[PDB]
Design a binder for this molecule. Sequence first.
Ligand SMILES: CCCCCCCCCCCCCC(=O)SCCNC(=O)CCNC(=O)[C@H](O)C(C)(C)COP(=O)(O)OP(=O)(O)OC[C@H]1O[C@@H](n2cnc3c(N)ncnc32)[C@H](O)[C@@H]1OP(=O)(O)O
Ligand SMILES: Cc1csc(NC(=O)c2cccc3[nH]c(-c4ccccc4N4CCNCC4)nc23)n1
Ligand SMILES: [Cl-]
Ligand SMILES: [Cl-]
Length: 426
Amino acid sequence: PHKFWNTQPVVQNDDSSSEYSFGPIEIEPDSFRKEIYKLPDGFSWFDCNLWDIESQDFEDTYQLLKDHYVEDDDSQFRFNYSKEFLRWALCVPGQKKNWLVGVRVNETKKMVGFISAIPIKVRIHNCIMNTSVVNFLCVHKKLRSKRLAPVLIKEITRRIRCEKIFQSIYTCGKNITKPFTIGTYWHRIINVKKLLEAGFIGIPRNMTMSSLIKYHRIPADKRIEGFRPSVDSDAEQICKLFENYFMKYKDVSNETMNNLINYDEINHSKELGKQAYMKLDKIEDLQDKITIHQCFNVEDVKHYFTNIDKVIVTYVRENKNKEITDLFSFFIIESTVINNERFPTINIAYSYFNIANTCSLKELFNEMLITAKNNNCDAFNTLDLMQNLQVIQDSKFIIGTGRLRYYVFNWKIPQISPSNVGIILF
Ligand SMILES: CCCCCCCCCCCCCC(=O)SCCNC(=O)CCNC(=O)[C@H](O)C(C)(C)COP(=O)(O)OP(=O)(O)OC[C@H]1O[C@@H](n2cnc3c(N)ncnc32)[C@H](O)[C@@H]1OP(=O)(O)O
Ligand SMILES: Cc1csc(NC(=O)c2cccc3[nH]c(-c4ccccc4N4CCNCC4)nc23)n1
Ligand SMILES: [Cl-]
Ligand SMILES: [Cl-]
């Protein structure tokens, strides 16, 4: 029984709609609460100054997440996002100062809560829109189970709506309301001895450390040439590469892709916003296609698909005309090994966006796995989004624990396969 989520414009688990459709759940451009939400006495909101990596706010945020953010099931690993990562992930083109929200104890100046939104452009079927991604919701462990989280969620909702944005995308490792897709975690072991020492895997009875090393080795043969790190001057080419990829896997006609309904222009009117509703005759119309994905202009490409040591790795393949034809990318997050004083962290790569045109996706990932090994990553993690199952199948990836639930706030999306989703959250 929910007490907060049952009041929100999201599809509920008990929803009994017998039709597949798309569109906003509600069009309420001026009826939302505009007054700041009250925090418990002694606590105050503040806009978190992540615009200078040396600021005190950035140290406070880094420390809060380091000790209190997402942990695995058994509380053996906790994410340890670096400050350079958080800057790359949160100070994105178009970001607003007030979408990085902290909660501080007034007497001690201790930061005890955080929630963030980043602006992104997304296509959802026949619509395109400026939207938000909510991430890094975090409450101090000593303040949990006191119903603070709905306060932080309502407050970021208010701050997003003040920017005339009424939808959001977010993920969760547990079921809340009805998710529009469910992602499966997959792990590729790179550094066996480190992951054994960390307790992530163990040594099977029918194996040895040496046979494990042998089994999990990244294949060294069949190397395809032409790959190099991306640079800023690649941005226009990379932008075109992404447009052609999303055009290839579209779930709407060519004319539709070229004339997407821009919800930003009609979300101010209950009558005009109705144009965004779209009934789907057959669910099979979407099979093998991408239905929802982020859209990147040249400025976004320059920011996201770059190379920052220990944060983000982007390589492109060139042909004999020196034209970019393929791309792989992954970001890098350390995790704390909670109960290991002498081996306190591991370095994990996470697949981001990958486009294979001149090679198979399996060959592309093999080149990416080698590069992640050479970037000192102990494992390579992926979701079964987009065409990744092609590589996950008949590979040495091992399934993870739990599932990643995808949600859209104030939009209707039929339950779809993760192959239909091109949205990666940090
Ligand atoms: C138009 C714009 C819209 C913008 C907003 C879009 C929505 C954004 C939504 C957020 C996007 C998250 C994206 C990410 O960052 S996902 C990762 C979230 N962060 C962590 O897991 C870090 C460690 N954990 C914690 O810090 C706390 O446990 C948190 C802060 C998560 C909850 O603290 P606490 O454990 O002290 O709980 P409570 O007593 O205060 O409150 C209980 C209520 O909160 C609901 N709850 C609990 N966890 C989540 C969750 N992860 N998403 C959504 N709802 C959640 C729960 O169902 C219940 O409601 P109801 O079941 O009674 O109804
Ligand atoms: C090799 C190794 C050692 S520890 C480790 N993962 C943890 O500890 C851990 C703990 C909690 C949640 C997790 N989700 C994932 C993950 C795994 C694969 C693909 C995406 C993933 N997520 C990352 C975060 N954003 C959304 C997508 N991993 C964890 N992997
Ligand atoms: Cl209030
Ligand atoms: Cl679920």
